[PDB]
Amino acid sequence: IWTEKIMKQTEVLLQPNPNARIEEFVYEKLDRKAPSRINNPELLGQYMIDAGTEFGPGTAYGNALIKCGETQKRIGTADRELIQTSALNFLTPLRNFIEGDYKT
Amino acid sequence: LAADAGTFLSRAVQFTEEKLGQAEKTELDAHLENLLSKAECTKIWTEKIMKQTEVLLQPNPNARIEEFVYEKLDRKAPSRINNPELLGQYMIDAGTEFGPGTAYGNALIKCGETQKRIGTADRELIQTSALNFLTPLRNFIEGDYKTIAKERKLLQNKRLDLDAAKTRLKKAKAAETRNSSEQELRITQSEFDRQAEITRLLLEGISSTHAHHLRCLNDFVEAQMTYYAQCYQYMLDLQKQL
Amino acid sequence: ADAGTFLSRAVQFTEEKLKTELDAHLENLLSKAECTK
Amino acid sequence: LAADAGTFLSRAVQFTEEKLGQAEKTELDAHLENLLSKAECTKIWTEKIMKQTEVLLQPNPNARIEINNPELLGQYMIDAGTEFGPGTAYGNALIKCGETQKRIGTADRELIQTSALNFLTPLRNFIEGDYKTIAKERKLLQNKRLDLDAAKTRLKKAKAAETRNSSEQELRITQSEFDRQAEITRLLLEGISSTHAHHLRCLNDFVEAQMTYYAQCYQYMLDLQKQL
């Protein structure tokens, strides 16, 4: 009981958006790869960078916008890395146990 | 009062003929054209960043929809515990059930605490950012932009009148009527010029807007720094105990 | 025109919604197993 | 599963392009086209004739959905005759006329049974069988044609030679199924020829039924005249 609760909530913590999970479930049943959606940080970075470019790269405001966009994209990548590691060395074993030994 | 309807009629017919391409448009001064264009672009991007920021802060869209409903319903949206703190609660309860003496119990309970601390830190960032960033910008978009929009319409209307008068003079034959039209043309031109200055004056204020926003961005940054810094320290502490 | 671009976007989404072929022997076996189940 | 949805998407998109006229439409062979048209016409006309025949035999719509008018009139006449006095000449005539009116009603019921089972039934059977079966195959033939045209569109849009070669194979697959379905529908269309000959024999039966009805009714009226 406890193992199941923790395994689920921690997955929620990793993927906050419910619609995304629903899409994953559908694509899992569809047996087809779900599109590689861009995460919030990178998208925000893109918006900031493009906006800064439009206002003028030389301008201090533009410079800041571009810099922040770059950092934001870096953060997004790091986040993706974190998500991959957790599901590979944490969620996996627990799921294994609940799905195999428990049946026996 | 009926004369006003005639003015609305005149502005319309002219707008149609100009759209018909039969009539041309008196181009505005390049400076004002430039000023208006800059103000617009600014608003467009500022709006986009504000929205994407919000999404970043509150990932759950359904929650945002519920807030909108209660906002329109003029009711309070029930508060909810964030994912980090919730996980902590489940973990702590588990640890307790498995037995505090057991190392597994010790670890689970210890972690649940760190998670709740982290959740608290998260809410701090959300409030700090909202207070220091989103609002300042929102203000600008809701107030100054609106005013400028109104003035833009006034000048646009005046131009319509001017163009209509021109067209009327173009098709003026009777000397006396043509002279009256000349007086009418002078009349509209003056009013058009007056509004143009009014508009340019207001547009001048946009220059400071960029500087004001820059400060807000610097603040947001400081907030993120604060959030991660706290969380990092919290994590370190947890590993030491475990 | 604009309709064509909208159709292109629709097709892209269809692609969003929707391979090393294994040796025949294995494939045939896989099909057999599935049919049996 | 997902395959079902995918197939539908391809067919509809190609069809819309052809409807818009931007995309060309692969046509069918004249022989198959002629056969399909003949079958459609047969069902349309046969349907109308059978329905009107029902109205003619049973004018009452409610009765058609389900005592006949002649027999009801006969009842009224006989009752009146008794009240007016059976011995009275007026009473005598009313009673005799009512009886004959009921006999005519009986013959009408026989005609309805005889005709419907020898004329309406066969016409209905053809529409329920030959036409429907053809329509099902005709629909699948249109689906196969859409698949073929979609393959041709994919082929023309397959700039890559290897992709075009794959589209050629796909086109061949669609063509084979398309041609197969055409032949299946064609066989059903050939059956319509026999349907016409069968229908002709049924028409003759309906004619015979009407003649018997009129002949019997005439004799009944003759007898009443003599008695009165």
Curated annotation (Swiss-Prot), chain C:
Membrane-binding amphipathic helix as annotated region, ranges: 1-18
Tissue expression summary: Highly expressed in heart, skeletal muscle, kidney and placenta. Detected at lower levels in brain, colon, thymus, spleen, liver, small intestine, lung and peripheral blood leukocytes.
Localization per record: Cytoplasm; Golgi apparatus membrane; Mitochondrion outer membrane; Cytoplasmic vesicle, Autophagosome membrane
Cystine connections: none
Leader sequence residues: none
Function: May be required for normal outer mitochondrial membrane dynamics. Required for coatomer-mediated retrograde transport in certain cells. May recruit other proteins to membranes with high curvature. May promote membrane fusion. Involved in activation of caspase-dependent apoptosis by promoting BAX/BAK1 activation. Isoform 1 acts proapoptotic in fibroblasts. Involved in caspase-independent apoptosis during nutrition starvation and involved in the regulation of autophagy. Activates lipid kinase activity of PIK3C3 during autophagy probably by associating with the PI3K complex II (PI3KC3-C2).
Remaining remarks: HeLa cells lacking SH3GLB1 show dissociation of outer and inner mitochondrial membrane as well as abnormal mitochondrial morphology. Cells overexpressing SH3GLB1 lacking an N-terminal amphipathic helix show a similar phenotype. SH3GLB1 binds liposomes and induces formation of tubules from liposomes. SH3GLB1 lacking the N-terminal amphipathic helix fails to induce liposome tubulation.
Oligomer status and interactors: Homodimer, and heterodimer with SH3GLB2. Binds BAX; induction of apoptosis augments BAX binding. Binds DNM1, HTT, AMPH, BIN1 and ARFGAP1. Interacts with UVRAG; UVRAG bridges the interaction to BECN1 indicative for an association with the PI3K complex II (PI3KC3-C2).
Family designation: Belongs to the endophilin family.
Domain remark from Swiss-Prot or TrEMBL: An N-terminal amphipathic helix, the BAR domain and a second amphipathic helix inserted into helix 1 of the BAR domain (N-BAR domain) induce membrane curvature and bind curved membranes.
Protein name: Endophilin-B1
Species: Homo sapiens (Human)
